[PDB]
Design a protein around this motif. Structure first.
Motif, PDB file in Angstrom:
ATOM      1  N   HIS A 172       4.683  31.263 -21.366  1.00 46.06           N
ATOM      2  CA  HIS A 172       4.995  32.683 -21.048  1.00 46.06           C
ATOM      3  C   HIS A 172       5.540  32.769 -19.622  1.00 46.06           C
ATOM      4  O   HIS A 172       5.027  32.046 -18.750  1.00 46.06           O
ATOM      5  CB  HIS A 172       3.767  33.573 -21.272  1.00 46.06           C
ATOM      6  CG  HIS A 172       3.214  33.484 -22.654  1.00 46.06           C
ATOM      7  ND1 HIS A 172       3.750  34.194 -23.717  1.00 46.06           N
ATOM      8  CD2 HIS A 172       2.185  32.768 -23.156  1.00 46.06           C
ATOM      9  CE1 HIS A 172       3.073  33.918 -24.812  1.00 46.06           C
ATOM     10  NE2 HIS A 172       2.107  33.045 -24.493  1.00 46.06           N
ATOM     11  N   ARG A 173       6.549  33.615 -19.414  1.00 48.88           N
ATOM     12  CA  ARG A 173       7.190  33.848 -18.094  1.00 48.88           C
ATOM     13  C   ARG A 173       6.417  34.937 -17.339  1.00 48.88           C
ATOM     14  O   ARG A 173       6.085  35.970 -17.952  1.00 48.88           O
ATOM     15  CB  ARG A 173       8.655  34.251 -18.280  1.00 48.88           C
ATOM     16  CG  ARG A 173       9.562  33.116 -18.737  1.00 48.88           C
ATOM     17  CD  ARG A 173      11.021  33.542 -18.784  1.00 48.88           C
ATOM     18  NE  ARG A 173      11.507  33.996 -17.483  1.00 48.88           N
ATOM     19  CZ  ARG A 173      12.684  34.582 -17.264  1.00 48.88           C
ATOM     20  NH1 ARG A 173      13.527  34.796 -18.262  1.00 48.88           N
ATOM     21  NH2 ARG A 173      13.013  34.957 -16.038  1.00 48.88           N
ATOM     22  N   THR A 218       7.877  38.412 -17.723  1.00 48.80           N
ATOM     23  CA  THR A 218       7.555  39.084 -19.007  1.00 48.80           C
ATOM     24  C   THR A 218       6.189  39.771 -18.883  1.00 48.80           C
ATOM     25  O   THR A 218       6.077  40.944 -19.276  1.00 48.80           O
ATOM     26  CB  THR A 218       7.626  38.090 -20.170  1.00 48.80           C
ATOM     27  OG1 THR A 218       8.956  37.572 -20.158  1.00 48.80           O
ATOM     28  CG2 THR A 218       7.305  38.725 -21.504  1.00 48.80           C
ATOM     29  N   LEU A 219       5.200  39.074 -18.330  1.00 49.86           N
ATOM     30  CA  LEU A 219       3.825  39.602 -18.145  1.00 49.86           C
ATOM     31  C   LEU A 219       3.831  40.706 -17.080  1.00 49.86           C
ATOM     32  O   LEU A 219       3.089  41.701 -17.254  1.00 49.86           O
ATOM     33  CB  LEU A 219       2.909  38.435 -17.784  1.00 49.86           C
ATOM     34  CG  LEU A 219       2.648  37.489 -18.954  1.00 49.86           C
ATOM     35  CD1 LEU A 219       2.264  36.099 -18.475  1.00 49.86           C
ATOM     36  CD2 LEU A 219       1.577  38.060 -19.863  1.00 49.86           C
ATOM     37  N   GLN A 245      11.944  38.139 -25.327  1.00 49.54           N
ATOM     38  CA  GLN A 245      11.141  38.417 -24.105  1.00 49.54           C
ATOM     39  C   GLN A 245      10.683  39.880 -24.067  1.00 49.54           C
ATOM     40  O   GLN A 245      10.168  40.287 -23.013  1.00 49.54           O
ATOM     41  CB  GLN A 245      11.938  38.083 -22.840  1.00 49.54           C
ATOM     42  CG  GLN A 245      12.249  36.601 -22.686  1.00 49.54           C
ATOM     43  CD  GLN A 245      11.019  35.727 -22.647  1.00 49.54           C
ATOM     44  OE1 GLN A 245      11.000  34.613 -23.167  1.00 49.54           O
ATOM     45  NE2 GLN A 245       9.965  36.233 -22.031  1.00 49.54           N
ATOM     46  N   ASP A 246      10.835  40.639 -25.157  1.00 51.62           N
ATOM     47  CA  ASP A 246      10.292  42.021 -25.242  1.00 51.62           C
ATOM     48  C   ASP A 246       8.826  41.970 -24.824  1.00 51.62           C
ATOM     49  O   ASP A 246       8.043  41.234 -25.419  1.00 51.62           O
ATOM     50  CB  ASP A 246      10.447  42.629 -26.636  1.00 51.62           C
ATOM     51  CG  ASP A 246      10.255  44.138 -26.663  1.00 51.62           C
ATOM     52  OD1 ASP A 246       9.335  44.635 -25.982  1.00 51.62           O
ATOM     53  OD2 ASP A 246      11.034  44.810 -27.370  1.00 51.62           O
ATOM     54  N   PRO A 247       8.417  42.707 -23.762  1.00 50.76           N
ATOM     55  CA  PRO A 247       7.028  42.682 -23.299  1.00 50.76           C
ATOM     56  C   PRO A 247       6.007  43.406 -24.195  1.00 50.76           C
ATOM     57  O   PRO A 247       4.829  43.327 -23.891  1.00 50.76           O
ATOM     58  CB  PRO A 247       7.060  43.353 -21.919  1.00 50.76           C
ATOM     59  CG  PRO A 247       8.390  44.080 -21.831  1.00 50.76           C
ATOM     60  CD  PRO A 247       9.293  43.521 -22.910  1.00 50.76           C
ATOM     61  N   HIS A 276       2.412  42.227 -25.054  1.00 53.84           N
ATOM     62  CA  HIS A 276       1.542  42.122 -23.851  1.00 53.84           C
ATOM     63  C   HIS A 276       1.015  43.501 -23.436  1.00 53.84           C
ATOM     64  O   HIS A 276       0.099  43.544 -22.589  1.00 53.84           O
ATOM     65  CB  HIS A 276       2.298  41.419 -22.718  1.00 53.84           C
ATOM     66  CG  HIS A 276       2.715  40.040 -23.090  1.00 53.84           C
ATOM     67  ND1 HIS A 276       1.799  39.048 -23.351  1.00 53.84           N
ATOM     68  CD2 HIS A 276       3.933  39.496 -23.292  1.00 53.84           C
ATOM     69  CE1 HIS A 276       2.432  37.943 -23.681  1.00 53.84           C
ATOM     70  NE2 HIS A 276       3.745  38.191 -23.652  1.00 53.84           N
ATOM     71  N   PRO A 323      16.156  39.038 -18.843  1.00 52.59           N
ATOM     72  CA  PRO A 323      16.272  38.480 -20.190  1.00 52.59           C
ATOM     73  C   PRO A 323      17.541  38.969 -20.904  1.00 52.59           C
ATOM     74  O   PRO A 323      17.877  40.132 -20.773  1.00 52.59           O
ATOM     75  CB  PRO A 323      15.025  38.996 -20.928  1.00 52.59           C
ATOM     76  CG  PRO A 323      14.063  39.415 -19.833  1.00 52.59           C
ATOM     77  CD  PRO A 323      14.930  39.828 -18.662  1.00 52.59           C
TER      78      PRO A 323
END
Ligand SMILES: CN1CCC[C@H](CSc2nc(N)c3c4c(sc3n2)CCCC4)C1
Ligand SMILES: CN1CCC[C@H](CSc2nc(N)c3c4c(sc3n2)CCCC4)C1
Ligand SMILES: CN1CCC[C@H](CSc2nc(N)c3c4c(sc3n2)CCCC4)C1
Ligand SMILES: CN1CCC[C@H](CSc2nc(N)c3c4c(sc3n2)CCCC4)C1
Ligand SMILES: [Cl-]
Ligand SMILES: [Cl-]
Ligand SMILES: [Cl-]
Ligand SMILES: [Cl-]
Ligand SMILES: [Cl-]
Ligand SMILES: [Cl-]
Ligand SMILES: [Cl-]
Ligand SMILES: [Cl-]
Ligand SMILES: [Cl-]
Ligand SMILES: [Cl-]
Ligand SMILES: [Cl-]
Ligand SMILES: [Cl-]
Ligand code: NA
Ligand code: NA
Ligand code: NA
Ligand code: NA
Ligand code: NA
Ligand code: NA
Ligand code: NA
Ligand code: NA
Lengths: 396, 396, 396, 396
Positions: free
Chosen positions: A358-359, A362-363, B266-268, B271, B389
Motif C-alpha cells: 500500500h502507498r 493512498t492511505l 488507487q481509489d482510497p 481505506h 494516481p
C-alpha cells in the motif's frame, strides 16, 4: 470464565471448538503436525466455570521483508469464540494476553490471515499483501514474440507426481521465500500436509499434478465440479524463464478451457500474452495482515529504496510511540523523540505500509495517515516501496 | 477497394457500418455532436469498387500526463471493417494512413479504447490506464473514525437534478482533468451528450441523480433490472474531503444493497471503511491505450519523480529510434545517438510506461523490456512512476 | 353457445380473445394485413348466448411439396378458446366445421404451427418439418479448405438496410420457396409485416441488418439482452455459393461470440467448418404440421424418388379410405379398392411422411404404421424420401 | 525425442500421462482390463531424451457395417501429448506410425471417439455416427393408442440388480451389435468394467438398476445432484416390442420428473407418445469417427440399398486412389482405374458416408464432395443409405 495456557487435557475441547468454528479443519491427526509450530505458552484458552469457549495461539514463523531480511514472526492462528459466548469481550482478552506474551518474547512483528476484514484493524493489524485471482481462457492464449522459452529444442518443464519430487519443491520454495517480501519458511510438517492434500480424496478433490522446472514448480488439479477448469494451488518461480516456461506448460493443458491461480497484483503473466485481457482478475482480497509489535525494531530491520535521497521526519504511531525516523542509503534509524510529529498513523496503517503493498499517498487520501507536507508523503511512498513485488506465501 | 477521406455523401454509409459494428451506437443526430471533434482530413473510408466497407478516424483531444502537462492527442475512434471484408488487411491500411496524418499533423501521442485486447499492440498501442470496478455492500459499510466529514453540523453534499447544475459539473471536471494523469478536456458537445444520457429512456436506463459538493460530484442511477444496485457512472473529486463526503452520501442510499463504480486501482474508498473488504474488486480491464508517435517529444514533455537522482541511459524503441535519455530534477532530455542500447522495448511498451500505470520491472519480468542492468530498471520504475494516481477520463 | 361465420362486428371480440391467448399478438392494425389472407367463410366464432369465447380460421396458402409441385393449402391459424370455456368441446366443434369447409372448397391439404405438441394429432395433423437451432461459437470458426468463396478478389455479399432492398429479398425468396419442399408463397402484406418487424422498437428488439448476395440473403439482429449473440431471423440461399458466402459474412461479425439460427436438420453449415462440432444443435422442435384432406389428390400431386423401381401396394388410412397405390418413374397413381390392406396408418402419420421429414421405418418401429412386409417398408422409405431437404418457410 | 513400442517399464509413465490427460481415467487396475484389447505392437510412446511425453495405441475391435457385415477395426485410443510438448508434431508422428502398422496388419478401417471436433479430419477420420440426447418430462408422457404392450395381463419387464443378470445382458447385446451398423463386439473385460461402474461409489455415482425384457434391457441410475433426473446409461432392444415395453417401465419411474438417454436421431421414442414434443433433443454430437484404411476393401465389404438400380461411376479419394465403382443388387465392385473422376472427396468424407449417417447431397452442398452430375448424387445418397438406422455402441 478465566484465561489460561491449555494443558494436554484441554486440546480435545479445543479440537471440538475448531471443528465447529473452521469449515476447513482437517482433524486431530493433521492438527498434531501444526501443533509442533506452537511454542510452549504460545496458546490461551477460556474455560466456562468445564469446556473450552475461547482459544487463540501463535506459531513461530520466519517472514521475509524488503531487503531480503528474515524476521521472527508470531503467526496468530486457531482463534475462535464459541457461538454460546459472543459479545463477552473474550477475543479482546485473548488477543491482549497473546500480544503481551509475543511482545515479551521479543517478536518484532505478529501476522495473521483474517476470516473477516472488519475484526483485526482495532487490534493493530493492517492488510500487508494483496491476493489477486487470475483466470486465463487458455483456448485464445498465444505467447508474445518477446516471451522467453519459445524456440526449437526440448522443454525444460516435466509433468511429475508431486510426492516423488518433494526434495526439488522444498529446495525451489526455500530459494523463493528468502528473496520475496511475504515469503515464509515452510517447515517439514507443512510439506507433509501439502503433499497429503495433493492426493485424490473419495468424494473430494481430484489428484494434483506438478510441472517441474530447475528454477520453478506449479502444483495444479482439475476442479471438483467444473471439469474444464484447472486450479493452480501453488506456483513458485525464482527466474522469469521458469515463470514463463511453467505458464507455457499450463496453457498446454489442451483439455481445459480455463486456468485459475491466486497470485499477486504484479504477476507478469498478462504481459506474456498477445492479449493481456485474457488473464482476467476474477477476485481480489487482503492476504497477510501485520501488527508491528516493536516500531523501531521493525522499521530499522527492513531495507528501503536506494533511489530516494536521505531524509529525516518525526513519526507518531497512535499509542505506540513517537520516533525520529532518518532514512538514507536504503537503511532507517528510528530513535525516541518528544519533537513535534510530522506524520501520524494508527499501528495498523504502519503494518499495511511495511511490505510495500500500500502507498502512503493512498492511505493519506483516506486520512488513515496525517501530514501537512506532501513532499514528505512522496518520500515515504518511494522509501517504503518494495523493489521485489510483495507476494503471499501460504495461509495459516 | 481504395482508401479516401470521406465526403459528406459517405457519412450515411459510415453510420450504417457504425450501427452494424457498435451496439452502443446512439444514432446520426448524436453522431453530429461527436463529428465536431473530428478535424478536416481526420477520417479515412474504404469503398468497394459504391458502399463503405471500412472506416477509421481520430478526434482532437487534450490529455493530461504526469507533471500536469496537457498534450495534443489524436483519439482513434469509429474504427470498423464490414463483416463482408475481414482478412483483407483493411484495418492495417487504415491505421497506417491515419498514423501518417497524425504524425505529419504534429501530435506527439495517439490514444484509443480497445473493443478487444489482442488487436492494437501490433500497431504500437500499449494499455496505459487500468479500469477497476468496486462493488460496495453498503448495508455493512461503516466509515473509519479517521475518515473526513463525520461530525456534527450540516452536510456539504446536495442531491440535485443533473441538468440544473451543468455549470458546476463542468467547472469541477475542468479542475479534475487538469491535475490528474489520464484527464481529458471534455468539450461542450460531450457535456450535451452526457446530460441527455442522464434522463430516463422508455424501456431503457432509469433517471440519473447527482450528488454535488463544492469540490466534487457523483452521477448515479439505479440499474435497469437489479433495483437494489446503484451504478455510479462518474465520480470526480478534487479534494479528499469531497471524495469522502460523496461516498458518505452514496452509502446513505438506504434502499440499495450495493453501490458499483468503475474507478482506478488507487481509489482510497476501501481505506475509508472499518472493513476494507466491503469494497470488492468485481472487474478489472485496460482503459486508455497510448501510441507514442514522437518518442523524444513525448518523453521530454512529461514530468518525472524528483526523488530518483539524475541518471543517463540509452533507450532503443523497436523501429522507433535510439535515444540518449537523461532524467534529473523531474525533467528528461532525449537526444539521438548511435551509442549501444542499455534498454530495448517495442513502441507499445513505452505507451504502457508513459502515464505510470505499469512498472518497468513488471514488463522486464515478461521480457517486453530488455536490459542487463537491474539498477537501471529500479531507476526507470521510480522516474516514470506518477505521484498523482493515473485515472481514466471518458471512453471514446 | 352456437358456431357462426363472424361479421365485421365480431372482430373486436376476436382481437380481445387474440390478445389474451397469443403473447406474440402485435395488435389490430397488423391483424388487418393478415386478415387479407382469410377467404370469405374462412373463419368460425363461438358466441356465449354476446362475447366471443372461441374462434378459428384458415388462410389461403401455397405450399411446395417434393417434385417442386405447389398445392393450394388451408393454413389453420388464430385458434383460441377463452379460459372461461375450456373442456366444452369448442375446439373439436370449430375444427370439424373448418375441415368440412376446407374439404368442400377443394383444398387437398391443411397445415398449421402447433402451440403444443399433444393437441393436433387427434384432428389428423402430423408434424411434417423439423426446426433445428444451430448456435455457432464464431470465435473458433475456421472455414474448411473445400468451402466455396475463400479466395482473392472482392466479396459478393453486401451489408445493407433491409427496407432499401425489399425487391431483391422478395425475388430471392420467390426462387427459394418454389424449389424447396415446405416453401410457402409470401404475399406483399407479410413482406410489409416482416420489414416493419426489422426496425428497432423502444424497449424491444434491436435494429435488423441484411447480408445480400445475388442468390441469397440473411436478416439478423443482436439479441435484446445477450449483446454477444446475433440471431439470424431468416437465411434464404438458392445456391451453395450463396449459402457459404452468407455464412463467411456472419462468422465475420467479430463483435459477436455466438450466431444462432433456426434452420433444418440437413443445413450443410457444420460441414463448411474444420470443426463440425462448433455448429451446435441447441434446440429441436416440430415445424409445419400437415393434415391430408384428400388422400388420392395429395399422393398423386407430389413427386417420388426415381431411384426406387415401380411397386404396387394397398394403403388404408384409418377412417380416410383404402387405395391401390402404384409408384413408378417418380409418379403415384392412387385409386379406390376393397382389396386387403398391406399398409395401415392414421391420417396424421401420412401427413408426417408426405414432405419426406420422417421415415416410414421409424414410424413403423413405433407401430404408427402397420405392415407385415419389411421390403414394402424399405420401398415406402425410399419413394417418399425428398431429394431436396424439407425446410420451414415462416410461422402463421 | 524418439518414437518406440512401449516396454512394460514404460506403462507407469503412460498411466501418469493418462491421469493428467483424461479426467475419466479410472486408474491402473481398470487400465489392465482395457490393455488386454491392445495387440502386440498396438502402442507407440514418445520419450524425452526418460519420461513419456506422448502415447497412442489401437485396440482390436469388431464393427458392424450396413448389410450386417462385421469388419476388423483398429480402435484408436489413449492418445495424449504432454502439456510440456505441444506444437512439436508429436500427434502427427504417432498417428503416421500407427496408421502404417494398422494398414500393414490388414485392418480395412480405423475408428475413434474425438475429445475435440477439429483434430482428426486432417488424419482422414470423418464423423460416422450421431449422438442424440433425449430428455423426457415423464410427468406429461402418455403412450399413443398405437404403441405396443398397452393391454391387460402381466408386464414382460422386470426390475433387477445388474450383476445378477450379466448372462442375459451379454446375450441381448450380442444379438443387438450383430444387426445394427455401429455395433461393436463387447469383450468379457468391458462387461467386467461396465458392471463395476454400475455399483454406488462413496461421494460418486448412485447405484444402477436394470429393466430386463427377453429381447432388451435398460441400465439407469438417478443423477448425483439432480435427484428428479434418471440417466439411462444404456438401452439395447432387438425388437420394437422390447423398446416400447422398456420405455413404459422408464416412464413408470413416478419419483422422477425427467428421463435422459444418449440415443440416435431415428430413436422411435417420440412417436410412442401422444405429444412427440415431450421427447426433447437437449444435446447432439458426433459419435464414432471412421478412417477408411483400404478404400476398395471397405466399399466392397458393406451392403448397399437394393432399391437403387445398378449404376457405375469413378470415385477419386484425395491421395487415397481412383476407382471404378459399380453398385448393383446391394453389392459394390471397386477396381483401380485412371479414367476421369466423376466424384472427388477427401478420405474423411468417405468415412462420414460409410455407415449411412450423412447424405452425399449434404456433403456436396458444403463442397466436401465434388461432382458435376446431380443424378449420380441422388444415386450415391440412396445406395449408401442404411436400412437399419446407425447407432453408437460404446465409447473407447
Ligand atoms: C483456518 N484456517 C484458514 C486458512 C487456512 C488454514 C490452513 S489449515 C490449519 N491451519 C492452522 N493454523 C492449524 C492449527 C492447528 S490445525 C490447523 N490447520 C492446531 C494448532 C496450530 C494451528 C486454516
Ligand atoms: C464505440 N464506442 C465504445 C465506447 C464508448 C463510446 C461512446 S459513444 C460514441 N463515441 C464516438 N467516438 C462516436 C463518434 C461518432 S458517434 C460516436 N459515439 C461519429 C464520428 C466521431 C466518433 C462508443
Ligand atoms: C400466434 N402465432 C404464433 C406463431 C407466429 C405467428 C406470427 S403473427 C400472426 N399470425 C397470424 N396467423 C395472424 C392472424 C391475424 S393477426 C396474426 N398474427 C388475424 C387474422 C388472420 C390470422 C403468431
Ligand atoms: C478417455 N476416454 C474417453 C471416452 C470414454 C473412455 C472410457 S474409459 C477407458 N478407455 C480406454 N480406451 C482405456 C485404455 C486404457 S484405460 C482406458 N479407459 C489402457 C490401454 C487401452 C486403452 C475413456
Ligand atoms: Cl522467510
Ligand atoms: Cl471481544
Ligand atoms: Cl512477453
Ligand atoms: Cl487534459
Ligand atoms: Cl488488417
Ligand atoms: Cl479513513
Ligand atoms: Cl409454395
Ligand atoms: Cl375440444
Ligand atoms: Cl467445406
Ligand atoms: Cl460388431
Ligand atoms: Cl501434431
Ligand atoms: Cl405409437
Ligand atoms: Na504492505
Ligand atoms: Na499476494
Ligand atoms: Na501507463
Ligand atoms: Na482508471
Ligand atoms: Na414430412
Ligand atoms: Na425446418
Ligand atoms: Na456414416
Ligand atoms: Na448414435
Amino acid at each position: 470464565v478465566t484465561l489460561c495456557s491449555p494443558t494436554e487435557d484441554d486440546w480435545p475441547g479445543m479440537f471440538l471448538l475448531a471443528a465447529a468454528s473452521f469449515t476447513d479443519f482437517i482433524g486431530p491427526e493433521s492438527a498434531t503436525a501444526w501443533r509442533t509450530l506452537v511454542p510452549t505458552d504460545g496458546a490461551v484458552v477460556v474455560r466456562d466455570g468445564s469446556e473450552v469457549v475461547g482459544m487463540a495461539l501463535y506459531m513461530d514463523l520466519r517472514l521475509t521483508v524488503p531487503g531480503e531480511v528474515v524476521l521472527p514472526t508470531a503467526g496468530l492462528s486457531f482463534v475462535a469464540v464459541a457461538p454460546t459466548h459472543r459479545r463477552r469481550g473474550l477475543l479482546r482478552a485473548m488477543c491482549a494476553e497473546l500480544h503481551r506474551r509475543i511482545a515479551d518474547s521479543g517478536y518484532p512483528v505478529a501476522a495473521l490471515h483474517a476470516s473477516e476484514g472488519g475484526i483485526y484493524g482495532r487490534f493493530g493489524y493492517g492488510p500487508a499483501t494483496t491476493l489477486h485471482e487470475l483466470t486465463v481462457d487458455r483456448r485464445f492464449a498465444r505467447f508474445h514474440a518477446d516471451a522467453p522459452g519459445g524456440g526449437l529444442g526440448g522443454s525444460s518443464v516435466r509433468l511429475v507426481r508431486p510426492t516423488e519430487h518433494r526434495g526439488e519443491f522444498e529446495a525451489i520454495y526455500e530459494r523463493w521465500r528468502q528473496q520475496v517480501p511475504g515469503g515464509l519458511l515452510r517447515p517439514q510438517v507443512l510439506w507433509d500436509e501439502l503433499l497429503a492434500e495433493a492426493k485424490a480424496a473419495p468424494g473430494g478433490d481430484r489428484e494434483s499434478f506438478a510441472l517441474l522446472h530447475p528454477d520453478g514448480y506449479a502444483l495444479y488439479r482439475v476442479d471438483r465440479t467444473d471439469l474444464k477448469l484447472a486450479r493452480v494451488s501453488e506456483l513458485r518461480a525464482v527466474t522469469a524463464d521458469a515463470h514463463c516456461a511453467l505458464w507455457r506448460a499450463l496453457i498446454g493443458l489442451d483439455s481445459m478451457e480455463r486456468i485459475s491461480i491466486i497470485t499477486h497484483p504484479q504477476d507478469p503473466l498478462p504481459h506474456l500474452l498477445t492479449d493481456t485481457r485474457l488473464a482476467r482478475t476474477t477476485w481480489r482480497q487482503d492476504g497477510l495482515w501485520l501488527r508491528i509489535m516493536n516500531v523501531p525494531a521493525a522499521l530499522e530491520a527492513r531495507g528501503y529504496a536506494h533511489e530516494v535521497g536521505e531524509f529525516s521526519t518525526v513519526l507518531e504511531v497512535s499509542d505506540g510511540g513517537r520516533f525520529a525516523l532518518k532514512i538514507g542509503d536504503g537503511r532507517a534509524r528510528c530513535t525516541p523523540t518528544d519533537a513535534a510529529a510530522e506524520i501520524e498513523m494508527d499501528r495498523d496503517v504502519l503494518g499495511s505500509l511495511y511490505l510495500g503493498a500500500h502507498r502512503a499517498s493512498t492511505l493519506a487520501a483516506a486520512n488513515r495517515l496525517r501530514t501537512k507536507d506532501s513532499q514528505l508523503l512522496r518520500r515515504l511512498d518511494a522509501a517504503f516501496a518494495s523493489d521485489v513485488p510483495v507476494q503471499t506465501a501460504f495461509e495459516f
